[PDB]
Design a protein around this ligand. Structure first.
Ligand SMILES: *CC(=O)NCCNc1cccc2c(S(=O)(=O)O)cccc12
Length: 123
């Protein structure tokens, strides 16, 4: 899987404007294969068009949590869904808490075309 493709699979959900219900994370973590060999503990889904996320690579340049400088913060807020494993979750029965919000996203960009390869965080 290419870096750009892995990002898309793990973070893009342009089919919905926002998480429907509390079971959104349980379904999405499963269908995007994030519960295949381990319960990925934390994951953020972005509900905006691929083009709008891609555009962030031309927005505000900031440092990445790791100190690298190829991160960008979106000018505007975006619809996101935070998925976090519950204190009780255990493989293979992965359980998640869903939290919908509108925040600015921060992504790491690379290549050419210069596209998002990692979801750094949101604010
Ligand atoms: C959710 C997600 O963004 N998946 C893309 C694959 N994971 C990933 C890509 C690039 C960097 C990176 C880092 S790092 O700290 O910049 O090295 C850490 C964890 C995952 C990724």
């Amino acid at each position: 899987e290419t870096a750009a493709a892995k990002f898309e699979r793990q973070h893009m959900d342009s089919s919905t404007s926002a998480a429907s219900s509390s079971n959104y994370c349980n379904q999405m973590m499963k269908s995007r294969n994030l519960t295949k060999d381990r319960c990925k503990p934390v994951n953020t889904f972005v509900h905006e068009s691929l083009a709008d996320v891609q555009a962030v690579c031309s927005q505000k340049n900031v440092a990445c949590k790791n100190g690298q400088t190829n991160c960008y913060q979106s000018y505007s807020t975006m619809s996101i869904t935070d998925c976090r494993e519950t204190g009780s979750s255990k493989y293979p029965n992965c359980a998640y808490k869903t939290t919908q919000a509108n925040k600015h996203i921060i992504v790491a960009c690379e290549g050419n075309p210069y596209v998002p390869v990692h979801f750094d965080a949101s604010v």
